[PDB]
Structure 1
Amino acid sequence: AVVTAAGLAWLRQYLNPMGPDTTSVTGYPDGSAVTTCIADYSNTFNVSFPPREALYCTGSSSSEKPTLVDADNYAKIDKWSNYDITLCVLALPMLRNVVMLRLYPHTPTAFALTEQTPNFPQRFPNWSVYSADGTRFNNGDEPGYLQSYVYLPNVDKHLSAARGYRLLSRGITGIFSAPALETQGFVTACQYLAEGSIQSQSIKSDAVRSVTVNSDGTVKNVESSSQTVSSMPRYVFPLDGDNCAPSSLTETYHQAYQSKATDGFYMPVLSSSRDNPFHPPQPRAIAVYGSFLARGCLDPVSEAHEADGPTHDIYRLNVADDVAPLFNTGVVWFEGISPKFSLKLKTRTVLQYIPTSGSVLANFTRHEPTYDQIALDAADRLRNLMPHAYPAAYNDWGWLGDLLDSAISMLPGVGTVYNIAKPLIKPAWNWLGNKVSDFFGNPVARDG
């Protein structure tokens, strides 16, 4: 009839993963009564303009050969460094490869992605170059942008030796800095559910064509193996790549965060469902689900055009992972950034495991199978009204917890004992104008 302490702690870490108060770590409030190990991964990366030595090419040049460093086309990228740039991070729900960084010479019209599968995508300290025309880059081309993945190795090691898993919470912080007189820029951030699924695209086999005109060999096997089959199953994400542009996100989502670049960002990525069931580790090739080109049987056609129906283009990422379902996909855009910037990324991912016997996790188990429905209902109610992001320095929210959670816990059904906790009003997060008010109208000091 009242929220427990464990449920409240879980709610606090789920809504504010990077909060200074969230020192202890607690599991999902369903009391699964299973030996579980809750792991907390905190990582920091100082990303800046990459040097030439950590910059590989994805074209057919590095096809069978391992990664090829740029053959001193780095002059063009220095030319980029002359002017202002744009920096995007895409936080897909992938467990490892927490975020994908991308550097552009100037703001793109849309989040384009290469059709051909890239060669050797690079973990963060290295990058991989893509051409201006949306194609893989070989040496002697026109560089279009740089891309890299931020990889957590310990997450891989632990997901290896685990019977099941579920991601408890994840937050990303973006402490931004630049030399004085070069702080100009804007930061935009937005979350949105991009629910992927295990799908297989429709492909075609190759018909065999043999002409036996041997004197006694005249079989003439001309059979058509050119039928339609299914490619290997891949986890496809329906991220609206054509609408990941900054203005699109701003006008489409009203919880979208906007500020000057120096404020950084802080995205506590949130769920999109009520329940968080355990899942077995299941790494799969990730792909981004593009737009279809052949309508096919969307219009009156014959059987000959039955097969080539509405087949969407699939962009292979050449990256394999098991994703956390039902979590939002986040994305920011640091547009108009000085080239000699410095971004301190700080990611905190806390997630639960069912340890495998004899594995490492078996020595760090925790038996606190607490049950709580009030906390889950409150999480459902808040998910739909919490801001998408915050300034990087914004933590330890006074309204959070003793005020917001208490004021909202009275609403669920009539599971309420305290008559009234506190009236709740619509906040106004005008970070650009310094006219920000919290959920109870109390003005916030933008300095803190």
Structure 2
Amino acid sequence: AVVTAAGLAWLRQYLNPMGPDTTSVTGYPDGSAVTTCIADYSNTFNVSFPPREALYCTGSSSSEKPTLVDADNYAKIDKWSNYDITLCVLALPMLRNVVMLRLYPHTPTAFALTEQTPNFPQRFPNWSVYSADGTRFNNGDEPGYLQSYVYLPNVDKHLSAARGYRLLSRGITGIFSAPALETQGFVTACQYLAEGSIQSQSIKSDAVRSVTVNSDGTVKNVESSSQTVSSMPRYVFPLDGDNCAPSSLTETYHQAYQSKATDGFYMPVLSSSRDNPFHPPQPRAIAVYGSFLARGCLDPVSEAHEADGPTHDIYRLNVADDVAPLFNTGVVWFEGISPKFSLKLKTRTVLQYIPTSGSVLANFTRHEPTYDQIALDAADRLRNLMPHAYPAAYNDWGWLGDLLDSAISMLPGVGTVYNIAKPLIKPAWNWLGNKVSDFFGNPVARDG
């Protein structure tokens, strides 16, 4: 009838992954009664405008040949560096490849993706270039944007030696810096559930056509193999690329975070579900749903037009991973950023493992299968109230825990012992205007 210490610690580390107090690591409070080891991955990256040495072409140029550095089309990228730029970071529930960074000369109208599969996607220190017309880039084209994946190798090593896994919490911090007289810019951040699933796109086979003109050989196998079949299965994310522009996100989600660029960001990505079961590691090729073009059977048609029905475009990322289901997808935009910027990305991903016999993980097991229903109910209750992001320096929230968790833990059902803990009011996270009030009306003076 009262939240235990383990449940409270899990709630703290789930809602505030990078809270300075969050030193110990605690598992999911479901009493799984399985031998588990909890791994915490803290990584730091220093992103800035890449030099020519770390740029590669995604086009057919590097198709069978390995990655090809840009053949001194870098002059166009310097032209980008003349003016302000835009920097998107997209945190899908990918376990490795924690975030995807993208650099634009100016803010796009949508989060476009290429219909053709890219060539050798590059891990963070290296980038890959994409043309301005939404296609893969070969040398001698018009670069449109740069893209890279931020990769955690230890996560891959540990996922190899694990019977099961589940993501416990994940946070991303974006400490922003720029030269003096160059601090101008804005930052927007949002979270939303993009519930991916294993789907296969509809493709066409090739009909065989033979003309046996021989005197004795007149088979004439004109059979039509050009039927509609299913491609190989991929984990497809229904992220709305066309609606990922910063303005649309700001005006769609109320808990979206907006501020000056210098404030940075701090996204504690959250789960969209009450439960969090273990899953066996099963990496798959990842893809993103697009939009359909031919209406097909959306109108009265014949069988010949059934095949070309509303088939949604599937954008292959050429990246394989196992995703954390029911976890939100985060997206942050830095618009109007000085090209001489420096973003210190800090990621903290804590996840639970069931070790495989004889594996490395088996030497770090930790057997307290604690149970706490109240903590899980409180997490579900709080999912819809927490803002999607905070300023990079805004950690160790006073309202969190002893106040917010206590003031919310006694609504669920009648699981209430203390009569009244504290009234809860609607906060106003107006970081742009310095009129921020927390969940209890206490103003938040600027600590950075």
Report the TM-score when normalising by structure 2: 0.99
* Deviation of the 1:59 alpha carbon: 0.5
* Deviation of the 1:144 alpha carbon: 0.6
Give, in whole Å, the separation in 1 of the partners of 2:296 and 2:18: 49
| RMSD between aligned residues | 0.6
2:154 alignment counterpart: 154
Deviates more, 1:296-305 or 1:152-161: 296-305
The secondary structure found in structure 2 opposite 1:357 is: coil
Give, in whole Å, the separation in 2 of the partners of 1:327 and 1:419: 34
Give, in whole Å, the separation in 1 of the partners of 2:401 and 2:188: 27
Give, in whole Å, the separation in 1 of the partners of 2:353 and 2:249: 34
* Deviation of the 1:296 alpha carbon: 1.3
Give, in whole Å, the separation in 2 of the partners of 1:142 and 1:307: 36
* Deviation of the 1:358 alpha carbon: 0.6
- Per-residue CA deviations over 1:200-237 (Å, capped at 9, x if unaligned) read 01111111101111111111111111111110000001
- Per-residue CA deviations over 1:121-149 (Å, capped at 9, x if unaligned) read 00000000000111100000011100000
Give, in whole Å, the separation in 2 of the partners of 1:401 and 1:51: 44
- Per-residue CA deviations over 1:232-283 (Å, capped at 9, x if unaligned) read 0000011000010000000000100000000000000000000000100010
- Per-residue CA deviations over 1:256-314 (Å, capped at 9, x if unaligned) read 00000000000000000000001000101100100011211111111111222110011
The secondary structure found in structure 1 opposite 2:40 is: strand
The secondary structure found in structure 2 opposite 1:351 is: strand
1:55 alignment counterpart: 55
Q: How many residues align?
A: 448
- Per-residue CA deviations over 1:63-110 (Å, capped at 9, x if unaligned) read 000000000000110011111100000000000000000000011111
1:354 alignment counterpart: 354
1:19 alignment counterpart: 19
Give, in whole Å, the separation in 2 of the partners of 1:205 and 1:142: 34
Deviates more, 1:316-325 or 1:300-309: 300-309
The secondary structure found in structure 2 opposite 1:312 is: coil
Give, in whole Å, the separation in 1 of the partners of 2:140 and 2:149: 24
Give, in whole Å, the separation in 1 of the partners of 2:109 and 2:293: 20
Give, in whole Å, the separation in 1 of the partners of 2:445 and 2:46: 28
Counting aligned pairs with the same residue, the percent is 100
The secondary structure found in structure 1 opposite 2:61 is: helix
The secondary structure found in structure 2 opposite 1:6 is: helix
Give, in whole Å, the separation in 1 of the partners of 2:51 and 2:203: 40
- Per-residue CA deviations over 1:17-45 (Å, capped at 9, x if unaligned) read 00000000000000100000100000000
* Deviation of the 1:447 alpha carbon: 2.0
Give, in whole Å, the separation in 1 of the partners of 2:140 and 2:201: 33
In structure 2, list runs of 5 or more residues that go unmatched: none
* Structure 1 stretches of at least 4 aligned residues deviating more than 2 Å after TM superposition: none
The secondary structure found in structure 2 opposite 1:426 is: coil
* Deviation of the 1:163 alpha carbon: 0.6
* Deviation of the 1:7 alpha carbon: 0.2
In structure 1, list runs of 5 or more residues that go unmatched: none
**Structural mapping, 1:334-349, within 5 Å:** 334-349=334-349
- Per-residue CA deviations over 1:45-74 (Å, capped at 9, x if unaligned) read 000000000100001100000000000000
2:216 alignment counterpart: 216
- Per-residue CA deviations over 1:178-199 (Å, capped at 9, x if unaligned) read 0011000000000011111100
Give, in whole Å, the separation in 2 of the partners of 1:204 and 1:72: 39
Give, in whole Å, the separation in 1 of the partners of 2:220 and 2:338: 67
- Per-residue CA deviations over 1:136-173 (Å, capped at 9, x if unaligned) read 00000011100000000000011111111100000000
Give, in whole Å, the separation in 1 of the partners of 2:369 and 2:339: 50
Report the TM-score when normalising by structure 1: 0.99
Give, in whole Å, the separation in 1 of the partners of 2:318 and 2:92: 15
